[PDB]
From Swiss-Prot, chain A:
DNA ligase involved in DNA non-homologous end joining (NHEJ); required for double-strand break (DSB) repair and V(D)J recombination. Catalyzes the NHEJ ligation step of the broken DNA during DSB repair by resealing the DNA breaks after the gap filling is completed. Joins single-strand breaks in a double-stranded polydeoxynucleotide in an ATP-dependent reaction. LIG4 is mechanistically flexible: it can ligate nicks as well as compatible DNA overhangs alone, while in the presence of XRCC4, it can ligate ends with 2-nucleotides (nt) microhomology and 1-nt gaps. It is linked to LIG4 syndrome: Characterized by immunodeficiency and developmental and growth delay. Patients display unusual facial features, microcephaly, growth and/or developmental delay, pancytopenia, and various skin abnormalities. Severe combined immunodeficiency autosomal recessive T-cell-negative/B-cell-negative/NK-cell-positive with sensitivity to ionizing radiation: A form of severe combined immunodeficiency, a genetically and clinically heterogeneous group of rare congenital disorders characterized by impairment of both humoral and cell-mediated immunity, leukopenia, and low or absent antibody levels. Patients present in infancy with recurrent, persistent infections by opportunistic organisms. Testis, thymus, prostate and heart. Interacts with XRCC4; the LIG4-XRCC4 subcomplex has a 1:2 stoichiometry and XRCC4 is required for LIG4 stability. Component of the core long-range non-homologous end joining (NHEJ) complex (also named DNA-PK complex) composed of PRKDC, LIG4, XRCC4, XRCC6/Ku70, XRCC5/Ku86 and NHEJ1/XLF. Additional component of the NHEJ complex includes PAXX. Following autophosphorylation, PRKDC dissociates from DNA, leading to formation of the short-range NHEJ complex, composed of LIG4, XRCC4, XRCC6/Ku70, XRCC5/Ku86 and NHEJ1/XLF. Interacts with DCLRE1C; the interaction is direct. Interacts with APLF. It is found in: Nucleus. Belongs to the ATP-dependent DNA ligase family. This is DNA ligase 4.
Swiss-Prot record, chain B:
This is DNA repair protein XRCC4. The chain holds residues 1 to 201 of 336 of the full protein. Residues 174-195 are annotated as: Interaction with LIG4. It comes from the Eukaryota. It is found in: Nucleus; Chromosome. Changing residue 134 to R: No change in sumoylation. Phosphorylations by PRKDC at the C-terminus of XRCC4 and NHEJ1/XLF are highly redundant and regulate ability of the XRCC4-NHEJ1/XLF subcomplex to bridge DNA. Phosphorylation by PRKDC does not prevent interaction with NHEJ1/XLF but disrupts ability to bridge DNA and promotes detachment from DNA. Residues 125-159, 178-195 form a coiled coil. It is linked to Short stature, microcephaly, and endocrine dysfunction: A disease characterized by short stature and microcephaly apparent at birth, progressive postnatal growth failure, and endocrine dysfunction. In affected adults endocrine features include hypergonadotropic hypogonadism, multinodular goiter, and diabetes mellitus. Variable features observed in some patients are progressive ataxia, and lymphopenia or borderline leukopenia. GO terms for biological process: base-excision repair; cellular response to lithium ion; double-strand break repair; double-strand break repair via nonhomologous end joining; immunoglobulin V(D)J recombination; positive regulation of ligase activity; protein localization to site of double-strand break; response to X-ray.
């Protein structure tokens, strides 16, 4: 089983401001 | 020490132009020197802080109000009279239907007019020099500010157009991340139905 | 119709200062009037266009190059000297190079009949100039003050747009975080239910 999705967002652990911004910026 | 040079016309010689030069330190209130010249001769007079306030009493005017009238009349309808024979100088104010002596000075004929005229011309050239320099300094600042403005205005344009692309651009990404969570939820449900 | 009034020092009179007033139309090359004054008397002279062209030739100089010399010397590395004789009214100036100087210009001026008229006009011109300048500096001072404000105004407008973006950004993310984390709750739940089911199958195989 994977911990992260193709974009880097965890499937299991909650996220927050700092982490989501990182994931989005990675999406172009 | 400051000075003002005005071009005036005497009642007894509307033909020729004369120059009135007034100089002082801080304010006319503390006394001043007045010089009259026709480009050949020159007449001077000194007015002490003492005399000024003395005049402000004979009139019954606040030393302030009185000095105000002199500033309007001497540093540039005002009328000027001068007698080359008495060296007496006086000016008056002219209102609608009336006129009145506003002041006078006993001037004395200067011994070396040329010196005085040369210093006056020298002052005017320095002033023209200084003013032309300032006109340059202020001309460049006007340029800097013009540029600086365009800069920020551009920043503004770019910033407002970014706040208008935010909602739409962030929502797509949210949909992308979100869809991934949903797919994982589906496969897990699917796997729980397996067993 | 232009003019330049400059102050100059004559060798034969280093004590007193004199004034030189040069006036022309368009260019010096077409000719000019020169006046010298000491504040009491005035001496005047004229130089025609042809006189200038000829003098340039007599000096073995390209005309425009010659007029350039006149500009630097009369209209205020280049060292110039000026001489004047009240007894002859002869005015001349030289350019001082290294160990070698040379006659640059010579004029036979004439003592004026009406010095005062000439001096008055000169002073009058200067005062008018001082006046035109002040007006201009005032017009530029207002334009300066207008831009100082117009910048402060948009500067604020800027900060506000930027601040508004940040508030909207965090606002959006906050909503996203909630929804995403709710799903993660589901995933953790389903995940663990699946493990439980896996351990259940393993117990059935072992006993």
């Amino acid at each position: 089983a994977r911990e992260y999705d193709c974009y880097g967002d965890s499937y299991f652990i909650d996220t927050d401001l700092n982490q989501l911004k990182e994931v989005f910026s990675g999406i172009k | 020490m400051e000075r003002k040079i005005s071009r005036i016309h005497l009642v007894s010689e509307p033909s020729i132009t004369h120059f009135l030069q007034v100089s002082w330190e801080k304010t006319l209130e503390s006394g001043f020197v007045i010089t009259l010249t026709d480009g050949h001769s020159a007449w001077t007079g000194t007015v002490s802080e003492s005399e000024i306030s003395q005049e402000a009493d004979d009139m019954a005017m606040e030393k302030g109000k009185y000095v105000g009238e002199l500033r309007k009349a001497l540093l540039s309808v005002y009328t000027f009279n001068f007698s080359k024979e008495s060296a007496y100088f006086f000016f008056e104010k002219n209102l609608k239907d009336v006129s009145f002596r506003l002041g006078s000075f006993n001037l004395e004929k200067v011994e070396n007019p040329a010196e005085v005229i040369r210093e006056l011309i020298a002052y005017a050239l320095d002033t023209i020099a200084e003013n032309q320099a300032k006109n340059e300094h202020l001309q460049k600042e006007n340029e800097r500010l013009l540029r600086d403005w365009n800069d920020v205005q551009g920043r503004f344009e770019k910033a407002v157009s970014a706040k208008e692309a935010l909602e739409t651009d962030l929502y797509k990404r949210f949909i992308l991340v979100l869809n991934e969570k949903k797919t994982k939820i589906r496969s897990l449900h699917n796997k729980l139905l397996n067993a």
